[PDB]
Design a protein around this ligand. Structure first.
Ligand SMILES: O=C(O)Cc1ccc(O)c(O)c1
Ligand SMILES: O=C(O)Cc1ccc(O)c(O)c1
Ligand SMILES: O=C(O)Cc1ccc(O)c(O)c1
Ligand SMILES: O=C(O)Cc1ccc(O)c(O)c1
Ligand SMILES: [Fe+3]
Ligand SMILES: [Fe+3]
Ligand SMILES: [Fe+3]
Ligand SMILES: [Fe+3]
Lengths: 319, 319, 319, 319
């Protein structure tokens, strides 16, 4: 069991960006820029910084050339600069390794803290970031499958209850969960920003990053991504969907990048900001909890997930 | 090989309606009316006459109570009254069994000819029909998953090449087909009205009705049908889809009625009205020919199909 | 200038419901339930309590039969039961008349505070409310023009800069505003929940309620409301739109109910939850600020708005 | 009154393309290609040949550089090469100037006949045309406001009844019209291809071209065109709409190109292919006949329209 610190939890606003290590920067760029249409905030020969259509912070996704494909950091923006200090004290009290860089770990981000959390994931907490042009009204750049915001991460861990209690201490609230008859949690969705989730815990060998998710405005935008991928003859990279999720009620699509990092395109969440928001508990045997339409969920979806790195860049041991 | 008659072929306009036999009229009404939203032109304790949102003839679907679930007739409307005379002459020269009725076989239809065509299917040709209120601007009745037109039929036959030649002599033009390296047709789509098809031949044990298809205005209308079915907990009746077809380029969904008759909901076809319309031939090994996004094709979709009746009301023998 | 109280402001979550007085309950029920499709949580011969599709609190709109059509209260839910006491102390320090009912002023709301705020508006603050069945996955009830959430109110007041400061002291953050060359604010949008706004101030004779807005999932849903009204032959009740707003970037529509209360249907907002969300200031002479497509602005839109009631039930005098 | 020829009328398939004369080829290219996204089949310094997404014939629109903007030709494709001959005999019997070119008047078109029809319009009839790659499944190219088909032309002429008769003898069928109490036609919509119209007559000083129309798959694509124009700051070129037409029931938008030629973007028509398709007659006083939502019809819409050229290249005198 992970103890609850005496130190006050940092006030987390929302998931902000993920930093993924990719093996071939040009193939990855072709997938994220030419196929998916994300907007390049900055790039050089080692890294590409991308942002979604409505974002005003520097980026939502950093692709870093690296020898082994993996999740290098999942970042959450905190409410004030002092929350970075709170995060540092908080994770130190939990006995976790932390690394603080006043100048940031990646471009566009200022004072930041990366930690190897209790579940083995590399989390970053930061407030400062360079504001860039919000492209929300740049309809001259709007693509038929435009990704408008980064919505959430989904982590794979062996002990979901244990991770659940840890994130609830951190301030995340469960919006929906999957439980057995005994009341044991099998998976949980938790938020800070007011949508169904900023992150989620799914049971399995971990630590591993299951996917990063972006949303679109409407359902036809998701359908265009599938049509485009079939026209580019890469439909084999469509893993699951499109479909309607039971948990979260979102219309979804799961596709795979060149390094097999899973990306989810999502839309039509509901508001969960009130403090007594009614948690929705689905039974582990309910066939409509994952796919509302009852579609069989691909085997690989449960088995394949991305490796994550510790703070020295080594791959975390999978349990 | 079916021979080409000397008598001129009747001018076929488009598929017009199908008469299906169902076993429990109340269960069927609940499906076609309460779930799918088709509009009742007329009904009594033995039959229900249904039309789509934009239709102006009496109906596109007749549900007839009967002992065994089956297709009792697939009807095509012809251009002029005299065309019913032509179809009669034509099918007699092919030595087919034909039954004529100046007063029709079902309400709403006038002088009609039914026949057991060469492939064993019960085709009806008619011109006269009672006009009813075209509901195309009845937005107060417009449902979120509204079916707006009857689009086509799809027949299962053991010898597609044979079937194809016959339908081509009848005036249908092939828009798309699937062939092997030897130039052998495994499936063909053919039209009269200017969309990709009015009917189609898929290979297998026949004669059997593979499905009847209706269209919607937009893609989200099809997604709504799935969502609605998941909410009524009958998602086990969603057979295949939704998806984008390779052949026809349509967005589609296949669902099963209470008697397992298969209904397809389809949208966004292209214009095939020009005489030199480019035929599109797909290779039997192209994984994108059926489902453009590469989705696995459900087994039942290839093996299950509805039985058809002869003019005496008996189930045609399957070959 | 309204002074900033020493008392802490209440923690406001979001706009929650409005209570409108209507003159003919049957006519209003026809407009809100039959035309618009809102869901009845409760109703008797004197009031109708309605909620949107994804709502879980008791209602988003209360129709109260009364002599003069007017806004009786615009309500905001606060984070904790204690925030109601903070709101009471806060408004008293401001010198406003306040009325506290531990049992609510309408059904489904518990301990609440109503006040005649500094601008003449009847605001209510409450935390307790009866939870009802969240219909977010009831696709069997989903209509083609489904209103899914209550989003914001828009208030008419003579002095925007004066009201803007008071609302900012209350904790609302300005997301977009319209200003002239001298930097004077002509209209402002402000929020608590993370969308562009929970309320907004537009300059004009007041206090008056300009409109209440609900949102839909997608753009076609707003188009359907227009189509259905044309089919019901009440297209004259369509006042402005549909269009794309410049400020807020939302797709919108304004319609008038039987008593001329204006309802806005809106969709496609962006996230404003970060504390340094960049404010977008539009110039008073930019022609795309109101309607991005440059459509002409209907004159009634600027002059007509609803009267508001003081706590005794009399129409507030308009300045 | 125009007499009915003895010679048989040519079998017209559908409107196929328009040749417009533009004063600045670069500006026109910018509008038609960069803003609207039409596809270039061929271009040089004097002309640009464009086609819609689903077209297979060489082009749907030809932009021809010239001193005075005007419509040089509105072309209809015929069913067989012989129909071109019938066309020539037919118009010659009507006493109209004709000009035949076995090699076509523009690239990609074969044996064609241009004439100065009875109303002063430069019509063209042709069968042969170079086929080009049909882009209907090129989703890699699909834009958010993709124009998919050329649908119709709309002509301005002083005597509508006079022209209606001549077009009906030509084989066009009236699907909808506007009449007064005396039964006098003020406007008519007529087709060949099975949609609401291939051409239409609106009373006014003529001959003049009112607009050429392209369609989109869904309503949101039309909305994107407006949004994009807003972003490019050319919203002043949006003339009327978006809206829902009463006549035709189509969702529409009218925009102006660099030389004021009017383009209509439109979607969701209904099938008019049956010979006894009910004609819908709208009363001249029905306020929903043009705009179903009852929106004011811009004055310019009624007064401005493009000049037409005679076979010599001179502007036809306007009556
Ligand atoms: O479909 C499922 O497997 C469950 C589910 C719901 C919402 C999500 O975001 C997700 O990633 C997975
Ligand atoms: O997906 C497939 O299996 C092929 C296909 C294409 C279009 C149709 O209408 C149909 O019924 C089947
Ligand atoms: O179009 C306008 O006039 C400005 C505007 C923007 C957003 C809103 O919600 C609103 O009610 C008015
Ligand atoms: O809205 C109108 O003014 C009449 C109308 C109907 C259908 C059309 O295509 C058109 O161009 C004009
Ligand atoms: Fe997810
Ligand atoms: Fe089909
Ligand atoms: Fe508003
Ligand atoms: Fe038009």
């Amino acid at each position: 069991e992970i103890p609850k610190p005496v130190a006050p939890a940092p006030d987390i606003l929302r998931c902000a960006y993920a930093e993924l290590v990719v093996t071939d920067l040009a193939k990855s760029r072709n997938f994220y820029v030419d196929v998916l249409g994300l907007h390049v905030s900055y790039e050089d020969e080692n890294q590409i910084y991308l942002r979604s259509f409505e974002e005003f912070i520097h980026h939502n996704l950093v692709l870093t050339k690296g020898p082994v494909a993996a999740l290098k950091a999942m970042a959450f923006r905190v409410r004030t600069p002092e929350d970075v200090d709170k995060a540092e004290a908080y994770y130190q009290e939990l006995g976790c390794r932390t690394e603080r860089r006043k100048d940031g770990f990646v471009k566009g981000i200022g004072d930041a803290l990366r930690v190897e959390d209790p579940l083995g994931f590399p989390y970053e907490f930061f407030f400062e970031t360079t504001h860039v042009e919000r492209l929300h009204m740049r309809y001259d750049l709007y693509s038929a499958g435009e990704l408008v915001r980064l919505d959430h991460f989904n982590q794979v861990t062996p002990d979901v209850p244990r991770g659940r209690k840890y994130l609830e201490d951190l301030g995340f609230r469960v919006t929906e969960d999957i439980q057995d008859d005994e009341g044991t949690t099998y998976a949980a969705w938790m938020h800070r920003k007011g949508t169904v989730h900023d992150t989620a815990l799914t049971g399995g060998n971990g630590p591993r990053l299951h996917h990063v998710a972006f949303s679109t405005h409407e359902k036809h935008n998701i359908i265009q991504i599938c049509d485009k991928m079939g026209a580019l003859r890469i439909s084999d990279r469509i893993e699951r969907g499109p479909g309607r999720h039971g948990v979260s009620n979102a219309f979804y699509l799961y596709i795979l990048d060149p390094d097999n990092h899973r990306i989810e395109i999502y839309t039509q969440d509901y508001y969960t900001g009130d403090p007594d928001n009614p948690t929705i508990t689905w039974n582990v045997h309910d066939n409509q909890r994952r796919d509302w339409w009852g579609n069989p969920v691909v085997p690989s979806w449960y088995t394949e997930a991305s490796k994550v790195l510790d703070l020295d860049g080594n791959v975390q041991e999978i349990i």
